[PDB]
Structure 1
Amino acid sequence: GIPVKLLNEAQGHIVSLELTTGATYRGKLVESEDSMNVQLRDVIATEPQGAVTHMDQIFVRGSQIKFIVVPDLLKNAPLFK
């Protein structure tokens, strides 16, 4: 359905994940899958308690993702037509 297609359409934009562990990763979406497995690059990780750590890449298993925030300019991508 459309939510996975929207995620694959976010590829190359900055997206922000929150995980089930509560952590937040903001970075450029490199790759995505029907599982919602995502790769991020050039990533700012916010620990749930507020700590901030920078990582060059992260791969996240899709089952551990809670929500993904994508850029708003995707609202009129062809997939919604």
Structure 2
Amino acid sequence: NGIPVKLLNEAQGHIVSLELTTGATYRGKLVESEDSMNVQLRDVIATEPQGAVTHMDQIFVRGSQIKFIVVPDLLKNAPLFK
């Protein structure tokens, strides 16, 4: 099974960042993920390529359109790796 997916799952709870193919970055508490990176977040900001920020409550995001997901540095320490 996908180790990045696993990592993402683990990160559940944390304040993750999230950019799409469109280039619109989000940053907030990760709620839920799946095998395909079907992310959900809570209490999340949303900045476009221009730079104008927009706050929002509950966002769901589809893994296909997701570019990359930034997790906090805490999960580097442990423990799903080895």
SS in 1 for 2:50: coil
| CA distance in 1: counterparts of 2:5 and 2:77, whole angstroms | 16
SS in 2 for 1:34: coil
1:11-39 CA distances to partner (integer Å, 9 max, x unpaired)? 00000000000000101000011110100
Superposed displacement of residue 59, structure 1 = 0.2
Moved over 4 A (4+): none
Superposed displacement of residue 48, structure 1 = 1.0
2:5 is aligned to 4
SS in 2 for 1:67: strand
Across the aligned residues of Structure 1 and Structure 2, the Cα RMSD in angstroms comes to 0.7
Superposed displacement of residue 76, structure 1 = 2.1
Unaligned runs of 5+ in 2: none
| CA distance in 2: counterparts of 1:76 and 1:5, whole angstroms | 15
% identical equivalent positions: 100
| CA distance in 2: counterparts of 1:58 and 1:74, whole angstroms | 23
TM-score, normalised by the number of residues in structure 2? 0.95
SS in 2 for 1:66: strand
| CA distance in 1: counterparts of 2:51 and 2:21, whole angstroms | 16
SS in 2 for 1:80: coil
